[PDB]
Design an enzyme around this catalytic site. Structure first.
Site, PDB file in Angstrom:
ATOM      1  CG  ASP A 182      47.898 -64.205  -1.818  1.00 23.67           C
ATOM      2  OD1 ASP A 182      48.859 -64.850  -1.408  1.00 23.67           O
ATOM      3  OD2 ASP A 182      47.484 -64.240  -3.019  1.00 23.67           O
ATOM      4  CG  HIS A 192      52.123 -60.179   4.961  1.00 29.39           C
ATOM      5  ND1 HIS A 192      52.012 -58.833   5.142  1.00 29.39           N
ATOM      6  CD2 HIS A 192      51.495 -60.439   3.807  1.00 29.39           C
ATOM      7  CE1 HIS A 192      51.319 -58.337   4.093  1.00 29.39           C
ATOM      8  NE2 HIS A 192      50.990 -59.287   3.276  1.00 29.39           N
ATOM      9  CG  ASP A 208      57.238 -62.588  14.564  1.00 23.98           C
ATOM     10  OD1 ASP A 208      56.353 -62.720  13.691  1.00 23.98           O
ATOM     11  OD2 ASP A 208      57.105 -63.023  15.736  1.00 23.98           O
ATOM     12  CD  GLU A 233      53.004 -63.457   1.660  1.00 23.27           C
ATOM     13  OE1 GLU A 233      53.828 -62.666   1.079  1.00 23.27           O
ATOM     14  OE2 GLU A 233      51.862 -63.696   1.120  1.00 23.27           O
TER      15      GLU A 233
END
Ligand SMILES: [Ca+2]
Ligand SMILES: [Ca+2]
Ligand SMILES: [Ca+2]
Ligand SMILES: [Zn+2]
EC number: 3.2.1.4
Lengths: 60, 534
Positions: free
Chosen positions: B160, B475, B505, B514
């Site tokens: 993010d 991610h 994965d 992530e």
């Protein structure tokens, strides 16, 4: 009581009587309760039955 | 003598896919019954013949065979040939074998920058995005006013784009310790960054981009409280960051964020002073304001962040964070008040050094700073107790790695983010080696590194863009939203858990796949010790 948890993409259940080790991790989102049983699993703390949380508190 | 059989790659032969350093340990794990093995140059010249030895890998519950070729110490390119099995991937033996990986991990940090466009060409692939999050950030959740206070720059935290002070703590702390521990090795290093022609070492330019953001996180009221994060209300989708227009907000303060701020800015003050002295003075003045708040407000305070659904990084206690802050204030300034704060806090830790540490438990950083300081006046007994704990813990990590079938320093412990901890343990080992030189510590550090570069069950590098069969599907929003098959390069993925085979994965697996600044920082520290190495 029954602990419901997801493993290898399958909903699974284990009674806490068959649960051996219980411990916690802190993630970037909250607490995870890991366990082993006669297998590995985990739940988010907020999804844990109090009986599992009791067992965590005694192990701690 | 040359090999006379044609060997094919076999995925049961698991080793560091980057390679090895002369005069250090070199092992493969062969998950197949075998005996003889050869180390072979590319033209087929045999340079070593050995016998692999059985070992039970308690972690994966199977016998593996260990090929120890540590005695091969001629620089070159080689592979391992194992009769009855096959061959490994090619690897290098070289004093500088990790420098490209170091620079690539640093490239990953550059490519995480927020508030600017970024661009790099890596393995012929052009990774880029336009300026993002240029309106950071609004104060509504802090003081009720829809007022923007500049909170641009810094690194996107993870997969993010939000920016979190507590996670920055271990990240920046670990990278600043790489600088201090390995200064003469890192100061000459050139990186692919916009600041490559300025008068500042490039390693420090990257850190400055983060400290520039950290400095914006003190409350505008002058109290010294530090906002916990800059965030959107909720996670955005898999979009490029320049396409995320939702407002971003300062989030209410925490005492841990405030202590981490003090530590980071106190370190920055001493580190940047040779290069940007005006910035250094800004840093120490800011540290003092937040330290004074902490002195006057001793309680643990969690951020009031439930109006957000992004990362929490809600460390359970600030006692370790406050210990670290005191240590860094003391190392930068030297005042008896800071020493006294540190020593009083440290003496109360039952275990002075912890093997398993990350953003929640940062006391080790303060212990390291204190132990390695050249300043006088430290209590001799406390120094000795920290020292003994350090060396005991390092010795335990050596045993764990020696007894694990893949050399994993973290043993059988698996949790979200554990790959970062595997390499973060190199801090304990390297500090131990400074205090009590011991080749076992350095070799165990190299076991941690080897584990994340292919000496593992999966036979895969855990770092995008590097080594054998690296992660392809982190991610990671840039990777998912761009037009490029390969993900953005240089990132250590978090790792599988609860078991040793549970990494997946796949982009959906935020739990195991992530990326994160704190994981990359640990990798950066681990590799830094082997840059410009002798
Ligand atoms: Ca520079
Ligand atoms: Ca903490
Ligand atoms: Ca992509
Ligand atoms: Zn951004």
């Amino acid at each position: 009581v029954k602990v419901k948890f997801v493993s290898s993409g399958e909903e699974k259940e284990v009674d806490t009587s068959k649960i051996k080790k219980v411990w916690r991790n802190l993630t970037k989102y909250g607490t995870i309760v890991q366990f082993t049983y006669d297998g590995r699993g985990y739940v988010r703390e907020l999804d844990a039955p109090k009986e599992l949380l009791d067992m965590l508190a005694r192990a701690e | 003598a040359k090999i006379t059989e044609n060997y094919q790659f076999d995925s049961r032969i698991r080793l560091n896919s980057i390679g090895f350093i002369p005069n250090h340990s070199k092992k493969a794990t062969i998950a197949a019954n075998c005996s003889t093995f050869y180390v072979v140059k590319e033209d087929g010249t045999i340079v070593y013949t050995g016998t692999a030895t059985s070992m039970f890998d308690n972690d994966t519950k199977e016998t593996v065979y260990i090929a120890d070729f540590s005695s091969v110490n001629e620089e070159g390119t080689y592979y391992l040939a194992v009769p009855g099995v096959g061959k490994s991937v090619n690897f290098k033996i070289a004093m500088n074998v990790y420098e490209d990986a170091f620079k690539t991990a640093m490239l990953g940090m550059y490519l995480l920058r927020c508030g600017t466009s970024v661009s790099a060409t890596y393995n012929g692939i052009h990774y880029s995005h336009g300026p993002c999050h240029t309106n950071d950030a609004y104060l509504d959740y802090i003081n009720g006013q829809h007022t923007k206070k500049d909170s641009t720059k810094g690194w996107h935290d993870a997969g993010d784009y939000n920016k979190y002070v507590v996670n920055a703590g271990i990240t920046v702390g670990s990278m600043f310790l790489a600088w201090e521990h390995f200064k003469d090795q890192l100061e000459p290093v050139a990186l692919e960054i916009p600041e490559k022609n300025n008068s500042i070492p490039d390693f420090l330019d990257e850190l400055k981009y983060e400290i520039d953001w950290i400095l914006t996180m003190q409350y505008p009221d002058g109290s010294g409280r530090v906002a916990h994060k800059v965030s959107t209300r909720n996670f955005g989708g898999f979009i490029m960051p320049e396409n995320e227009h939702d407002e971003r907000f300062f989030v209410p303060w925490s005492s841990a964020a405030t202590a981490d701020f003090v530590a980071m800015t106190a370190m920055a003050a001493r580190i940047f002073r040779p290069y940007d002295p005006q910035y250094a003075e800004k840093c120490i003045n800011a540290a003092k304001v937040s330290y004074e708040f902490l002195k006057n407000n001793p309680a643990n305070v969690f951020a009031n962040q439930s109006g957000f659904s992004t990362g929490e990084y809600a460390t359970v206690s600030d006692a370790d964070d406050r210990l670290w802050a005191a240590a860094e204030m003391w190392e930068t300034l030297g005042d008896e008040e800071y020493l006294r704060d540190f020593e009083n806090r440290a003496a109360q830790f039952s275990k002075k050094i912890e093997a398993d540490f990350d953003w929640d438990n940062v006391a080790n950083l303060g212990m390291f700073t204190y132990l390695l300081s050249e300043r006088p006046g430290k209590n001799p007994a406390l120094v000795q107790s920290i020292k003994d704990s350090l060396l005991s813990t390092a010795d335990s990590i050596v045993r764990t790695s020696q007894n694990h079938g893949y050399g994993r320093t973290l043993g059988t412990t698996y949790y979200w983010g554990c790959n970062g901890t595997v390499v973060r343990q190199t801090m304990i080992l390297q500090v131990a080696n400074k205090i009590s030189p011991n080749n076992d510590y350095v070799n165990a550090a190299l076991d941690a590194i080897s584990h994340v570069f292919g000496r593992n069950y999966y036979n895969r590098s855990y770092v995008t863009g590097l080594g054998i069969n690296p992660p392809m599907n982190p991610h990671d929003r840039r990777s998912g939203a761009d037009g490029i098959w390969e993900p953005w390069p240089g990132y250590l993925v978090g790792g599988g858990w609860p078991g040793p085979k549970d990494w997946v994965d796949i982009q959906d697996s935020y739990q195991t796949n992530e990326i994160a600044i704190n994981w990359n920082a640990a990798l950066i520290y681990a590799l830094a010790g082997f840059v410009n190495y002798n």
